[PDB]
């Protein structure tokens, strides 16, 4: 019995790329023209692409012509596709032809969540309000759950650069980003310097100032 199978599907964000691959069973794709097809939530089917024998051709549908790319491996027998909210579909690798000159895979799910960008949340890592003596204190601005990079962090808008350490962003098991931005200043200037962190997020056009202060 003739088989194909799809791998590489999951959750993509808007504008995104993700790559799909097609393994087959018991047959040789070399003399075939293979075709990927997606089914839309409308239930309706959609030929996405087709690559010919010897790869003499690669024909794309119009709503995907230029973000997408198909390729074939006539030796280990694999086909592939490179890569919108509307691209959300179940994707089927397919083989055209006949028993004389027709065969499909189970499909894999592909979804594209609508937001290309998400602004960051600015919260104050407070020193303390009991403060006094004449020692070091440390405060800051915890910039959480943005994407994509980057997040430039400033303090008072250009004037307190000394003792400042803007930590590298970390990729949460959620996929959203997260950077700590700290500054060592006197335990004695906690009350008069006020400390203002200017988190400018260029991708989502988001600018959130946040006052850092003792609770």
């Amino acid at each position: 019995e003739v088989q194909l199978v799809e791998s590489g599907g999951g959750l993509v964000k808007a504008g995104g790329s993700l790559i799909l691959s097609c393994g087959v069973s018991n047959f040789r794709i070399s003399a075939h023209t293979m075709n990927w097809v997606r089914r839309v939530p409308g239930g309706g089917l959609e030929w996405v692409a087709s690559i010919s024998t010897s790869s003499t051709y690669r024909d794309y549908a119009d709503a995907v012509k230029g973000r997408f790319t198909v390729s074939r491996d006539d030796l280990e027998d694999f086909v592939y596709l490179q890569m919108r909210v509307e691209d959300t579909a179940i994707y089927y690798c397919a083989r055209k032809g006949s028993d004389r000159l027709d065969a499909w895979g189970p499909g894999t799910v592909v979804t594209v969540s609508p937001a290309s960008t998400k602004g960051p949340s600015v919260f104050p890592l407070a020193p303390s309000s009991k403060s006094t003596s004449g020692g070091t204190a440390a405060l800051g601005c915890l910039v959480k759950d943005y994407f994509p990079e980057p997040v430039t962090v400033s303090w008072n808008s250009g004037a307190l650069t000394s003792g400042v350490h803007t930590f590298p962003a970390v990729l949460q098991s959620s996929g959203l980003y997260s950077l700590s931005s700290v500054v060592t200043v006197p335990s004695s200037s906690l009350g008069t310097q006020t400390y203002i962190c200017n988190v400018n997020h260029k991708p989502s056009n988001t600018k959130v100032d946040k006052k850092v202060e003792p609770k």
Binding site: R39, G44, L45, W47, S50, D59, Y92, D99, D102, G105
Partner: protein
């Protein structure tokens, strides 16, 4: 080249003889193929070249036509056959499908029995609240669910799930999940769920005063 199938939803019973029309926007000779798909399975090729039967497919199916007009014919419907049917113009290097024809088990216009559940507090406790909305045993399949929290119309924070024709009543059941954090939920008092359907002469609402 544009293929268009008619009708969008064909209703019939067990043993029926039914038919689907596919029409090309230009003359496509006899280059047309038919496909059965069952939900989540691979689709299955039944018919090719306007009328040549794929080996492995029972006699009770047959296709025809040429030019821009085609027609598939299941003769004697079986339970094995309640599914969706695709027309394909397959060329040398490109192709184009119709919008498909879903074949269901016909029954009487029965509206959705509309219930509404609130979020419990073993989950209102952890940081989320899941506001559910059920449309029990309705037909046909088309039904519209539009959330209303303190009477604003929601959009895109609700997710749905439609059962297949229950094995007994041929009715459908729908499930529409409204996800919010435990902090955008305890902001608003009323939680309204509004169902439009062929058997209701008007849109049915089901809500709850928080707490």
């Amino acid at each position: 080249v544009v293929m268009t199938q008619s009708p969008s939803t064909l209703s019939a019973s067990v043993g029926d003889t039914i038919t689907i029309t596919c029409r090309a926007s230009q003359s496509i000779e006899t280059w047309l193929a038919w496909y059965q798909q069952k939900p989540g399975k691979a689709p299955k090729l039944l018919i090719y070249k306007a009328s040549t039967l794929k080996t492995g497919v029972p006699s009770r199916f047959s296709g025809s036509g040429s030019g821009t007009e085609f027609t598939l014919t299941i003769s004697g419907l079986q339970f094995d056959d309640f599914a969706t049917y695709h027309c394909q113009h397959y060329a040398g290097y490109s192709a184009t499908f119709g919008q498909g024809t879903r074949v269901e088990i016909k029954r009487t216009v029965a509206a959705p029995s509309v219930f509404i559940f609130p979020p419990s507090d073993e989950q209102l406790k952890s940081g989320t609240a899941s506001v559910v909305c059920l449309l029990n045993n309705f037909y046909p399949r088309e039904a519209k669910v539009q959330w209303k929290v303190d009477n604003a119309l929601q959009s895109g924070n609700s997710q749905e799930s439609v059962t297949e024709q229950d094995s007994k009543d041929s009715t459908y059941s729908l499930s529409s999940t409204l996800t919010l954090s435990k902090a955008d939920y305890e902001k608003h008092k009323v939680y309204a769920c509004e169902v439009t359907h062929q058997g209701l002469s008007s849109p049915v609402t089901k809500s709850f005063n928080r707490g």
